[PDB]
Amino acid sequence: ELLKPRTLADLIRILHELFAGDEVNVEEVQAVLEAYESNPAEWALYAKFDQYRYTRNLVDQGNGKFNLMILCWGEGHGSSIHDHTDSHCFLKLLQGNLKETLFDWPDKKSNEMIKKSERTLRENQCAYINDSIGLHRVENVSHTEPAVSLHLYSPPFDTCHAFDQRTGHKNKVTMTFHSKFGIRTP
Ligand SMILES: [Fe+2]
Numbered sequence: 001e002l003l004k005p006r007t008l009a010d011l012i013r014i015l016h017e018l019f020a021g022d023e024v025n026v027e028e029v030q031a032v033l034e035a036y037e038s039n040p041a042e043w044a045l046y047a048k049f050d051q052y053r054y055t056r057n058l059v060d061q062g063n064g065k066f067n068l069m070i071l072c073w074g075e076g077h078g079s080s081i082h083d084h085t086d087s088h089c090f091l092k093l094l095q096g097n098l099k100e101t102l103f104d105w106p107d108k109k110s111n112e113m114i115k116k117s118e119r120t121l122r123e124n125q126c127a128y129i130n131d132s133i134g135l136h137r138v139e140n141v142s143h144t145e146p147a148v149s150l151h152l153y154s155p156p157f158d159t160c161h162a163f164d165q166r167t168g169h170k171n172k173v174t175m176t177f178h179s180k181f182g183i184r185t186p
Helices: 008-018 026-035 040-046
Strands: 055-060 067-073 088-095 098-103 115-121 126-129 135-139 147-154 159-163 170-174
Touching: 008 026, 008 040, 008 055, 026 088, 026 126, 026 147, 040 055, 040 067, 040 088, 088 098
Parallel strands: none
Antiparallel strands: 055 067, 067 147, 088 126, 088 147, 098 115, 098 135, 159 170
């Protein structure tokens, strides 16, 4: 039974219920994430920005079933084109706007990667990606407003690939956290 999460903590409780089994109902997870209304006071603890690039801040480990994290994007900060290591990946905007660009998986031949499409994700909107859909890049193109997003990955993964837009070549990347449970990482 899906009910509206009244707070971030309630959202987390609901997600634990949704991921108690060995499969995932993607539509239900997306619906509950969209239903949570961002309340900056509830996630201020996690919203730790860096001057130079976006930060990943771990919020919950899902009893091993998922990682829930908050990403903080300075003005002009963006990501690489990346995959999601055969996991489900949900993204919900908590503050500001992000541009999401979708790319096709590259062919064996070296070539410019062309965009399938792009969209602007606005506050409280929740998107979903997985490797079968394609690759994406996420960017805060704003010059005046930092952005903050909530990401859920299941199963958890700590490695993925980044793709060079000019060739499609991929490189393995290990993700890092800037903080965990509100505590900065050494
Ligand atoms: Fe992503």
